[PDB]
Design an enzyme around this catalytic site. Structure first.
Site, short mmCIF file in Angstrom:
data_model
loop_
_atom_site.label_atom_id
_atom_site.label_comp_id
_atom_site.label_asym_id
_atom_site.label_seq_id
_atom_site.Cartn_x
_atom_site.Cartn_y
_atom_site.Cartn_z
CD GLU A 146 -2.76 4.40 -2.01
OE1 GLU A 146 -3.64 3.53 -1.88
OE2 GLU A 146 -2.69 5.41 -1.27
CD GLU B 152 -0.98 2.34 2.48
OE1 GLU B 152 -2.13 2.60 2.05
OE2 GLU B 152 -0.25 3.22 2.98
CD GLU B 153 -5.82 -1.03 -2.95
OE1 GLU B 153 -6.52 -1.93 -3.48
OE2 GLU B 153 -5.78 0.13 -3.38
#
Lengths: 161, 161
Positions: free
Chosen positions: A49, A52-53
């Site tokens: 996460e 990806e962000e």
């Protein structure tokens, strides 16, 4: 499925990686996070996460906090090993390495984020052993189920007696 | 509704209060526990479940561990202030003040119970500050919801900056 957030703290610069969502609470700094995939360990969800962000590559170090509502959301301490931000333009408006002390004091964050910033500051000043928790899978006895158990890290000599 | 267990440890005698269920795993020592009622704080569930199963009056001191399955079950450290067992005959086969070291070593318990016994032993030897976590209610920002947040106890000077 459980949600997982990553609090990526650079202990050498006292910086904490935070985001503002493009479309939700766009003025509140938060930790990157999202849903675990089937079979994914909690730490791997955090690291994925975050990457990806934000574009930042990191390693799971501990669990910092468990958030329960009416279900579970796990906030993890991660250690960065890349530092150049390349944020997901569809998802985030901003992404910065913020001074941890600034996050601990700002009104432009959520109460949970602020609490976790203050907990990181306590570990930065007094040792991460003060705040770090572990997560481990342990078996049921009555049935074939498994649990995840979250608790303060237990030194190896006691875990095993 | 969340489940809650009480690990009632007498720090003066090194004894831990345990039960064997009358009708389920009757040969495995476990901590008393059960379901929270609507509106009940986690600590109050622990103290009530302990009293109902065992006759022992106690006070909430901390959260020791969070158990997650496929939902949540909270195991709490309690401090006894009565010591005469009067167990619930419909529910328990046995109820004893067991030596904590005996619980930490026995095969006649569950892996989670044994882990929590070992964690209590670590606190008994090295200080409860090493193991104790708090639970607090904090508000959401995006909606009117509330969360419960579990983490290592944060000294008052940091909680408030």
């Amino acid at each position: 499925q459980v949600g997982v957030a990553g609090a990526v703290f650079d202990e050498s610069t006292r910086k904490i990686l935070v985001v503002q969502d493009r479309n939700k609470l766009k003025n509140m700094w938060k930790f990157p996070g999202g849903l675990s995939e089937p079979e994914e360990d909690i730490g791997d969800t955090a690291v994925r996460e975050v990457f990806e962000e934000t574009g930042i590559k990191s390693e799971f170090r501990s669990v910092l906090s468990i958030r329960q509502q009416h279900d579970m959301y796990i906030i993890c301490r991660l250690k960065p090993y890349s530092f150049t931000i390349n944020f997901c333009q569809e998802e985030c408006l901003r992404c910065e390495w913020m001074d941890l002390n600034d996050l601990a004091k700002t009104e432009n964050t959520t109460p949970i984020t602020s609490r976790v910033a203050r907990l990181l500051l306590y570990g930065y000043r007094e040792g991460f052993d003060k705040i770090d928790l572990t997560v481990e899978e342990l078996p049921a006895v009555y049935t074939g189920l498994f649990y995840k158990l979250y608790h303060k890290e237990l030194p190896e000599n006691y875990k095993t007696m």
